[PDB]
Amino acid sequence: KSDFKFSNLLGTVYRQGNITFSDDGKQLLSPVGNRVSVFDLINNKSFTFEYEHRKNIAAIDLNKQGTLLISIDEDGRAILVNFKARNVLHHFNFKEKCSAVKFSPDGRLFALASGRFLQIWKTPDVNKDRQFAPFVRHRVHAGHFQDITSLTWSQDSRFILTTSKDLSAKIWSVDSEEKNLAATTFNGHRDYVMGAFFSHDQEKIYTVSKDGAVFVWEFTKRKYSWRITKKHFFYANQAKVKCVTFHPATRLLAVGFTSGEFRLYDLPDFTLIQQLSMGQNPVNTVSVNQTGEWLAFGSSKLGQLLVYEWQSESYILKQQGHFDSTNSLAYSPDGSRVVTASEDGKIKVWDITSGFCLATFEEHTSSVTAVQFAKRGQVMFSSSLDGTVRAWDLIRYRNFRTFTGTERIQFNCLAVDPSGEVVCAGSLDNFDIHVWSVQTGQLLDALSGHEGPVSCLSFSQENSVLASASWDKTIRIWSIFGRSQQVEPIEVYSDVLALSMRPDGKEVAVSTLKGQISIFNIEDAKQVGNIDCRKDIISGRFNQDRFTAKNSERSKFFTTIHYSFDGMAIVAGGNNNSICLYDVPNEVLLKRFIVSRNMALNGTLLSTRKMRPEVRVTSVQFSPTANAFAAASTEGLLIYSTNDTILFDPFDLDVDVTPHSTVEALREKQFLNALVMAFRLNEEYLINKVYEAIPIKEIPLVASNIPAIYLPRILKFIGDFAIESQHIEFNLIWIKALLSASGGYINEHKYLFSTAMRSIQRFIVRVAKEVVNTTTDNKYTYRFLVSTDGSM
Amino acid sequence: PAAVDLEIRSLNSFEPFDEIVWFIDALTQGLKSNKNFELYETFMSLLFKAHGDVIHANNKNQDIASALQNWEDVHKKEDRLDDLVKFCMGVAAFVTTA
Amino acid sequence: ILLMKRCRDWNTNAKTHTIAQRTIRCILMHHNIAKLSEIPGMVKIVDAIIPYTQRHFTRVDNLVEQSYILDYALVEMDK
Amino acid sequence: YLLVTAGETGWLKYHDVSTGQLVSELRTKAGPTMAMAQNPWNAVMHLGHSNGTVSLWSPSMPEPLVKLLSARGPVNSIAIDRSGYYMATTGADRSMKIWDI
Amino acid sequence: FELSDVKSSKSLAEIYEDDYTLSEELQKAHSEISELYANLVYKLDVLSSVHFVPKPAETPTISMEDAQPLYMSNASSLAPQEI
Amino acid sequence: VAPTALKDDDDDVLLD
Amino acid sequence: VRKLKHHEQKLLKKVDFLEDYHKYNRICGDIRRLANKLSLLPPTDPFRRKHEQLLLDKLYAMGVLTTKSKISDLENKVTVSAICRRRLPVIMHRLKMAETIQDAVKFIEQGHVRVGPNLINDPAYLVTRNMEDYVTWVDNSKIKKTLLRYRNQIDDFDFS
Amino acid sequence: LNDIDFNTYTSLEQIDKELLTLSIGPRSKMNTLLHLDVIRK
Amino acid sequence: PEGRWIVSASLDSTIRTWDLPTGGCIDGIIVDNVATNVKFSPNGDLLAT
Amino acid sequence: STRLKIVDPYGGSD
């Protein structure tokens, strides 16, 4: 009964276009394919915008006011979005490829590099009510005879410097009256002019060329004219200038070369501040902060993004995404971290709160097919097509064990026992499930009985039974632990593609090739429910198709499914443009999500392969926090969450229940009534207001009297609220009072409080213990210093 | 974080050790406010890392000894947090398990 | 150096680490810490004592957490 | 029976269409080629460059036969008459010059 | 061991000069083999792949990706038994 | 001025 | 140009400038080059011994090598015809699914053919040996109905 | 009452002086400060 | 769309927006012509009458 | 000259 919205895109920090810094300097805007990601450098957070282009973004820009963001794709279709409210304002089609877009520092105008033309437009007014046709064109300029590489605004918004592949830099006046002031073209460079910049006083102009030459232009007498007074050269052996940026206030010049290295220079002295290398791929985009202290670089080939603090030679941000599509994903048991794997063969560990990669593992030679955590959570296992299964200790970030078959079997699926003592893998070529001992690393035995390749495995987190399904049109339940081994095969109408264990361990759901999700009772081994999915799935006609989408049967089944931790929902995805969320007990579709709106991707709408990227979801999982689910796709890891919660969803509401009446009860000191009415309304602002208004002396009284029905919901509220709240002791007092008062009830119903307790344990472990760990170290460090004999 | 670390290292470490004593008095005031508790504890951790030997060598000095003793009086009070954390882990682990 | 070598070995076993810690504590509280540093080979012996003592600290600490089940039993019995 | 190409690499290349083998490839060493024209009377190639010069080339020689300064900026276009006696150039400095080549 | 029977291009001083200041050529081929194997794997992968397969890709160098967190120390990566 | 415009010595010899 | 007379041919020659297996030829040559450079390496090198085995395993898995082989045999066993035999329409013809290779290509283009759970519409797709067993008709194909109807075995519960 | 009128509520800086409160910022700052030496290296 | 408001029209030539959590009218309009239909857009950015 | 004069719905008002 939750509404999920796309929140952020992990696994991709930069694909192409230009990166920009916020005017305050505290945020970085990076194009990620079709969408724009915003990184909070100070708060170490990140979000991705929900709006979406038809194609990949080419150029973006944010005005100095911080109110308007303009993004333009590769065919010239622009989207104007209110940056603060994150809502799209207008769409405009400039009908030409735009290389660069820049706001004037005044913000009234923005300039467009379109072919060999410079278009100046008037910026729409954000404050005003939404206009039907807001874009009015200011001026158009045509001097260049060849495409414009870049453009630069003057600090006073009165002049623009445009550089083109005509080996020329050209200056324009934004006011017609001042045309005589600046109507000059600067020649002299032997290659493409990549950047032209004003000095801070604007008396001097610096032009940079692709060949690696910097010219200093001054207005001087031989009666007065612009002349090259000084010439500097980057003596790169073969590297060419790829991107250049300048900061007039601090006179900093940052140049990124095609060899993958960048230099920082001081002008006009040309003093090389520093020289570093990001790799062997071209540096595509370079940006400078408003204060000039942070430098952002981006390489498109490997999708690297680097924020460099050259003052202290420190790294604010240093991230590289997956080169290939993410094949699998796995949440940490508490939901603090998510592990991803790629067809390349490298695993990356991500932190949910920050959205940045903590470690990358490159032990696997071939594509990693599955990653899974143990119930303990410190250990992670991965299976790969290279023929190995590896165990990773995520406290010390080390591959402490490798499992392999006798004959190098390609593993596609993986399952780990709840006790973390048995690991099982399956293959498309062997038909046998290999079992290893975690402690010893030796093959225990091979579970035989499937006639077809094994598609999917899972242990029950509680019962510890193993379910395996295959293209043999059957599912087998293995009771491997115990003195005797039993197997129970259940027949299914079609090949089984995906499989999921209900968190209770009493039912298993399978997705088949006929587009059916069938739920079976494990103990009785009989079907208990079924869901149709063919009609719900959305699949687009591929450009190469010679048959219609409606007649097409390419992918009308789900290749991956997962239970919600409540057990009442299943999220499903496949080789299609749909992620469907079904309600198991009612067998109805809750909601359908469109994965991409990129017209480039194939599924959105004779020796040589006609192969081009297509949209597909490789893995889905629910967050153990019960607020989000993540879907691994070609573009990256899409995370949908319920954080905003604008919905009004009251519970057991009555006429006498009102936000005013809740506040009245607080003023009357009726804390139990106020808290209950706040939950019945189910308004986050009101629950927070009542929650913090209850005095410490009254908490044990209120906690003891909470009705049982509201107990799971308040426990959920504290766990989610405490993780990011500053009131550590206040939230700890509340948890202790609830646990001490309703501990027996929670024990009687573990499944009902499974997600609430897990969120609480995340807070007590990931923040509360770490605070105490610092405080206790100072206690013992202090005792040693004072109690001990000092040196002579 | 870079700025904080540089300043703490740069505190003068020569007798009469005025700055180090001043910093301890500053941090002792911060703990009394019961605000920004995790940073003040972290600052004191960085003080011992960078100037522990100076403090250890001259622990008998009245100014350093008194400033640390005042810090202990406040820091001793802030041990009730450990009791809450230990209680909740003990019961949360037991309740969810058995 | 002879006594600390025994303390290093006793520390590796959890059934005898308690004796090693109190012996180590007595040395620190009755010897000059500066002097202990110059002794050749002491730092390597000290290097081998720290990793085990941290393992013993993570344990025992976990036993303190587990002891709070007696609180939860007492509050339940009050009800 | 020769095909001639020029571009931004500063390479002048001759290709024999009859035999399909690269007759000669010459380095201009003057940056990108802005204009190109053949002289129909002696089959010598005229390349324009960004330094305002016009160079004359033959496939068998590794260096230009002649160099002519005919502009204060890049040479945009070159035209040669049928007799191969005159040459007209236009640079990006509002200049047009007629040459006796 | 192979003994050169051709005149040494290095003068008798040079043979002593280099002595003042497992094999690079052996490692040079190793890079070449990896390049050839990587290219061949890509070409065969595209032909037998259902889905799209992307084509595989002094001065101090920055490591974009690291095997462990930056805040983590190598000493903290060792067990007591290892020490 | 450009058209685009807006709108002691310490001795190094030291006694050793 | 027009056909050259006897005397024209003598004066000027080789002026005739201005199913292709160029790509498969490149694969066969590249395999030979990679095997050649491997031989140049010292025999005892573990790096050499590992990569040659990987090359044998890849070609075995692709199916171009019908049986396991040595490095030497890759010099002569690998042939363009061997790669052409893995071609999906060629596999289909051998399976008797299609009467002619041209018929198989039309079926692949029309979307009647699936290799495992995946529908393949690219006739250029090369079938690996593990997937060879699972090339079949798509379930709802009008063709597969025709096969079953001929046998009088078309079971409507399967929708095929 | 304005915060109610706009259906918003900003959490207090400190609920009570006697109660321990963390800083109003990210929780990774403590980790970054303690290990700044190894991050640099 | 968020379930928090009701917009209603009546023959008295007025359109009223009601806040359900508080159960009170928060906005009012007078239209020259009576409004016979009222619908929210699925996104909620538009109101059609 | 050096200046496109485009009369369109979005510009050329002057």
Question: Does residue H21 contact residue A729 with C-beta atoms inside 8 Å?
Answer: yes
Q: Which amino acid is at D100?
A: D
Question: Does residue A316 contact residue A307 with C-beta atoms inside 8 Å?
Answer: yes
Question: Does residue B81 contact residue A771 with C-beta atoms inside 8 Å?
Answer: yes
What's the distance, Cα to Cα, between the start and end of chain C in Å? Answer: 57
Final resolution, Å: 2.7
Whole-angstrom Cα distance, residue C78 to residue C58? 32
Q: Which amino acid is at I39?
A: K
Whole-angstrom Cα distance, residue H12 to residue A689? 9
Q: Which amino acid is at A490?
A: I
SS3 D99: strand
Whole-angstrom Cα distance, residue A756 to residue A749? 12
- In chain G, residues with a C-beta closer than 8 Å to the C-beta of A514 are 139
Question: Does residue A444 contact residue A436 with C-beta atoms inside 8 Å?
Answer: yes
- In chain C, residues with a C-beta closer than 8 Å to the C-beta of E83 are 47-48, 51
Beta bridge partners of J11: J8
Residue A787 tokens, joined: 């109690």
- In chain B, residues with a C-beta closer than 8 Å to the C-beta of H32 are 1
**DSSP per position, D63-92:** S-SEEEE--SS-EEEEEE-TTS-EEEEEET
SS3 J11: strand
Whole-angstrom Cα distance, residue A628 to residue A408? 37
* E and H: number of Cβ contacts within 8 A: 11
**DSSP per position, G55-89:** HHHHHHHHTSSSS---TTTHHHH--HHHHHHTBHH
Burial letters A617-655, b for 16+ CB under 10 A, else e: bbbbbbbbbbbbbbbbbbbbbbbbbbeebeebeeeebee
Q: Do A318 and E64 touch (CB under 8 A)?
A: yes
Q: For A695-769, where are the alpha helices, taking DSSP H only?
A: 699-705, 711-724, 728-748, 754-763
Whole-angstrom Cα distance, residue G61 to residue G89? 19
Chain-centroid distance of CA A692 in Å reads 33
* Tokens 């009458």 sit on residue: I49
- D–H touching, 3+ CB–CB pairs within 8 Å: no
H1 at interface of B, judged by CB pairs closer than 8 A:
no
Whole-angstrom Cα distance, residue D92 to residue D72? 8
How far C64 CA lies from chain E's nearest CA (Å)? 23
Q: What contacts A251, CB < 8 A, 6 or more positions away?
A: A199, A200, A266, A267, A268
Residue A254 tokens, joined: 């940052």
A748 at interface of B, judged by CB pairs closer than 8 A:
no
**DSSP per position, A495-539:** -EEEEEE-TTSSEEEEEETTSEEEEEETTTTEEEEEEE-TTT---
Question: Does residue A708 contact residue A677 with C-beta atoms inside 8 Å?
Answer: no
SS3 A751: coil
Chain-centroid distance of CA B72 in Å reads 9
- Nearest CB among C32, C75, C76 relative to A789 is that of C32
Chain-centroid distance of CA G125 in Å reads 7
Whole-angstrom Cα distance, residue A609 to residue A773? 58
Chain-centroid distance of CA B87 in Å reads 24
**DSSP per position, A612-675:** -----EEEEEE-TTSSEEEEEESS-EEEEE--S------SS--TT--HHHHHHHHHTT-HHHHH
- Nearest CB among A743, A754, A791 relative to B91 is that of A743
What technique was this entry resolved by?
cryo-EM
Q: Of A215, A163, A231, A235, which Cα lies nearest the Cα of A192?
A: A163
Mutation site for A-interface testing, chosen from J2, J5, J8 by largest number of A Cβ within 10 Å: J2
- In chain A, residues with a C-beta closer than 8 Å to the C-beta of H7 are 683, 685
Question: Does residue D26 contact residue D36 with C-beta atoms inside 8 Å?
Answer: no
Whole-angstrom Cα distance, residue A654 to residue A180? 74
Whole-angstrom Cα distance, residue B19 to residue B13? 8
Burial letters G10-45, b for 16+ CB under 10 A, else e: eeeeebeeeeeeeebeebbebbeebbebbeebeeee
Whole-angstrom Cα distance, residue A11 to residue A356? 9
Cα dist. A152→A104, A159, A183, H2 in Å? 9, 9, 15, 45
Q: What contacts D53, CB < 8 A, 6 or more positions away?
A: D30, D67, D68, D69, D70, D71, D75
Beta bridge partners of G111: none
Q: Which amino acid is at A159?
A: F
Q: CB atoms < 10 A from the CB of A404, how many?
A: 18
Question: Does residue A40 contact residue A641 with C-beta atoms inside 8 Å?
Answer: no
Whole-angstrom Cα distance, residue A622 to residue A565? 7
Residue G97 tokens, joined: 């699914």
- E–F touching, 3+ CB–CB pairs within 8 Å: no
Burial letters F1-16, b for 16+ CB under 10 A, else e: ebbbeeeeeeeeeeee
Ramachandran quadrant class, A335 (left: phi over 0; alpha: psi -120 to 50; beta: rest): left
Q: What contacts A241, CB < 8 A, 6 or more positions away?
A: A194, A208, A209, A210, A211, A212, A234, A255, A256, A257, A258
| Strand bridging mode A496-501 / A98-103 | unpaired
Phi, psi (5° rounding) for residue A70? -110, 130
Whole-angstrom Cα distance, residue A445 to residue A442? 9
Mutation site for I-interface testing, chosen from A2, A82, A646 by largest number of I Cβ within 10 Å: A646
* Tokens 């230990």 sit on residue: B86
Question: Does residue A306 contact residue E62 with C-beta atoms inside 8 Å?
Answer: yes
Q: CB atoms < 10 A from the CB of A64, how many?
A: 15
Q: Computed over its alpha carbons, how large is the radius of gyration of chain E?
A: 23
Whole-angstrom Cα distance, residue B40 to residue A446? 57
- In chain A, residues with a C-beta closer than 8 Å to the C-beta of D90 are none
How far C44 CA lies from chain E's nearest CA (Å)? 10
Whole-angstrom Cα distance, residue A681 to residue A667? 18
Question: Does residue D16 contact residue D2 with C-beta atoms inside 8 Å?
Answer: yes
Strand blocks (E) in A124-270: 136-141, 148-153, 159-164, 169-173, 185-186, 193-198, 204-209, 213-221, 224-233, 241-247, 252-257, 261-266
Question: Does residue D13 contact residue D7 with C-beta atoms inside 8 Å?
Answer: no
Beta bridge partners of A605: none
List the subunits that have 3+ CB pairs under 8 angstroms with E.
Answer: A, C, G, H
DSSP G126: B
Would you say how long chain E is, in residues? 83
Mutation site for A-interface testing, chosen from E34, E37, E58, E65 by largest number of A Cβ within 10 Å: E65
DSSP run (H or E) holding G52:
helix G46-62
- Nearest CB among B72, B91, B92 relative to A782 is that of B72
DSSP H10: P
Q: Of A715, A704, A702, A712, which Cα lies nearest the Cα of A673?
A: A702
Whole-angstrom Cα distance, residue A511 to residue G116? 15
CA dihedral sign of residues A487, A489, A495, A496:
negative
**DSSP per position, A32-96:** ETTEEEEEETTTTEEEE-S---SS-EEEEEE-TTSSEEEEEETTSEEEEEETTTTEEEEEEE-SS
Burial letters A290-307, b for 16+ CB under 10 A, else e: eebbbbbbbbbebbbbbb
